[PDB]
From a paper:
[name] (DAHPS) is a key enzyme in the shikimate pathway for the biosynthesis of aromatic compounds. In the seven-step shikimate pathway, the first committed step involves an aldol condensation of PEP and E4P to form [name], catalyzed by DAHPS, which can be classified into Type I and Type II enzymes based on their sequence relationships. Plants and microbes use the shikimate pathway as the biosynthetic route to produce aromatic amino acids (AAAs), while animals rely on acquisition of essential AAAs from their foods.
To further investigate the mechanism of the D154N mutation in relieving the inhibition by L-Phe, we determined the crystal structure of [name] at 3.3 Å. The [name] crystals contain one dimer per asymmetric unit with each monomer exhibiting a canonical (β/α)8 TIM-barrel fold common to other Type Iα DAHPS enzymes. Next, we used the AutoDockTools-1.5.6 program to model the complex structures. During the simulations, L-Phe was harbored in a cavity formed by helices α3 and α4, β-sheets of β6a/β6b and their adjacent loops, and the N-terminus of the second subunit of the dimer. Strikingly, the distance between the carboxyl oxygen (OE1) of Q159 and the nitrogen (N) of L-Phe was centered around 2.8 Å in the wild-type complex, while a much longer distance (centered around 5.3 Å and 5.8 Å) was found in the Aro3D154N mutant complex. Taken together, the hydrogen bonding between L-Phe with the two key residues (Q159 and K222) of [name] were weakened by introducing the D154N mutation. Although the D154 of [name] and its counterparts of other type Iα DHAPS are located outside the inhibitor binding cavity, substitution by Asn weakened interactions between Q159/K222 and the enzyme inhibitor. The [name] crystal structure along with the molecular dynamics simulations analysis suggests that the D154N mutation distant from the inhibitor binding cavity may reduce the binding affinity of L-Phe. Among them, the wild-type enzyme demonstrated high binding affinity for L-Phe with a Kd of 31.4 μM. The mutant Aro3D154N exhibited weaker interactions and higher Kd value, 10-fold of the wild-type Kd.
Numbering used by the authors:
A (entry chain B), B (entry chain A): 1 to 370
Amino acid sequence: MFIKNDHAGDRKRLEDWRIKGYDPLTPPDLLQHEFPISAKGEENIIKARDSVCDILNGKDDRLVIVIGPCSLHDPKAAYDYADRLAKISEKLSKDLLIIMRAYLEKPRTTVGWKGLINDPDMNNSFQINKGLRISREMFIKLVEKLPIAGEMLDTISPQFLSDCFSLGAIGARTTESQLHRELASGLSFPIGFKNGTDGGLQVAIDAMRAAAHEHYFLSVTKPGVTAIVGTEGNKDTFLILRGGKNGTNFDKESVQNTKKQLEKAGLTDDSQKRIMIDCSHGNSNKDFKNQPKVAKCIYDQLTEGENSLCGVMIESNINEGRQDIPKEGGREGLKYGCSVTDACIGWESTEQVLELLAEGVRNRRKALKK
Amino acid sequence: MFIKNDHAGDRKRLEDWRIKGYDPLTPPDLLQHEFPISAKGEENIIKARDSVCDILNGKDDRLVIVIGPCSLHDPKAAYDYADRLAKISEKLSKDLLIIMRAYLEKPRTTVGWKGLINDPDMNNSFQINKGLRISREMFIKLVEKLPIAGEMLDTISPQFLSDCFSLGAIGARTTESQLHRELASGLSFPIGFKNGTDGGLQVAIDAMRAAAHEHYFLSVTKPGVTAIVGTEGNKDTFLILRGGKNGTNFDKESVQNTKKQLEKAGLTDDSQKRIMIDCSHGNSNKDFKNQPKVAKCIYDQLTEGENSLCGVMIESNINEGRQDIPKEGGREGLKYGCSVTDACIGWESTEQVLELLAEGVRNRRKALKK
């Protein structure tokens, strides 16, 4: 702490006796001035957002693919993965609309590395200020290469990193939080809510419904100070089928149920597409090798003409599997292109699945006579 | 809106085209100045906190009863009720500690009054600065009458009102939120989380495990600027049973099952008491009539000497049931002392209930020969 609470632990102060101190923080202004976005990255982002919103509204028959490392921990690897992916995306420019999984943390119940933002040297130093710096810079570099997608959590943290997202996602732990639903209703891109830890759809229905309305809440402004914010709202929201405590909900029947309750909520019609399926995480029962297989199911629903499906989430890294960051050595003790956060499928798995989906969208074209 | 995004709609800019613009805000330093907490309120607040920290470590053999409106919405009415409860609160004082349920906003997914802070004019005018004024004014009056407790909904707001809380809960929906755990660890009083909307008990155990720890995050400081905060961690933590979509857990079995899971967690031992019961919300199935009978169940388990219990929650009001705030009417014409959120028990029932539980505490005393 730069400022230190000299009175920590005294239980005769009304407040703050549990507070160690404070460290200076950088307002989003200064960073947004320091790390601006190039017009090319700007253009990437905007046209990306719109096209997504097109696919949502029934306007485009393409399919959205949010794929990438579950968390990002090493930048050079991010440029490698982004250029390799911009290659294959170049190849599929007319079918998939692929967007990268730029995630800077895995939220956890158990102690660990707290994400790229919190622990920048990965040794629990917590000079988060740097974390942000380098982390935002990586985006002013990536957005020139391809569109990226973050997951929301710290109402405060996006202020620094929202202008780079062309889409966002919301986690199960946080999907019931009216905080976050407000936050989406402010955000400047489409947002996908993950269905509850037990599987529940209702939480995600409720989040979309919430996020569409206009909201007022306390938030943090670009000059690092507090004000009251008004959100026009965000109607271009969707649902991400995910969890396993109740089991896997990727099965076709599950998708139909999602659709029946979505038209039971006025949240979709036959012409709009609001369903994203997330394989990594809950449906894979926590094994990377299970990721390819579900792909099999989604493709198949496309082949029969499933038009509700808007997009698909994929856990993916240059090298497959996962690894434990060493007690000692930090980032230098990690294998190159290998996920710290979740087990990913290897680049090879990833390209074979992409060819499969490129074809599935074509077959949906042929059976619908589209 | 004071400031107005003049670009709200041009989905052509990097960011902020879903933000209406913002409204100025009284910083917490200032609101901690305009309304200070008199020395008597200071005394009540801290004596209560230490009392609850005793009950939590088994040093006290009395019972924490958090009782009050589902939502506090009429400050005259609240003063009247805090009067009454404080009067009988020392009637039973030897028996248990009575903390009043000072909540400001009831979490939802639907349209309606977003609490006293967001819309305290009750007209969807949203004059939030005043909301805060009013509300802190309220608080500093109430801590002179009896200590209080509130529901931590968001993490900017308690900068304005924390020092009136002797004690706080984390709403069922936000328990899984990393954010509310990090916030929890700094607060200078006891926190008890509510179990997940399924009824699941792992969320709350994990939250207790996290909040014990020391965390560093981004938070708002008393002057009104964001900063990096380190917390000591709050070890003064517990669990609240409240119900779910499944498993209403107000029974002897369910409590013992829970105690066993907390023991398996290394959070408590047979001397400590880490379990609080909510008798509204799920357990009551939105039926105020079923609250007293749940008191009865409790009273029975205390007659049996159940020593892991630290408290009970209770949504009580001057007049029972609830009433519908007319959306096309004002708060001008509304029944006095009738909670406008979840259905409450009457004043007479409240006398009754409280007497009955006092008896229960006496009975547990005799069971272990204390």
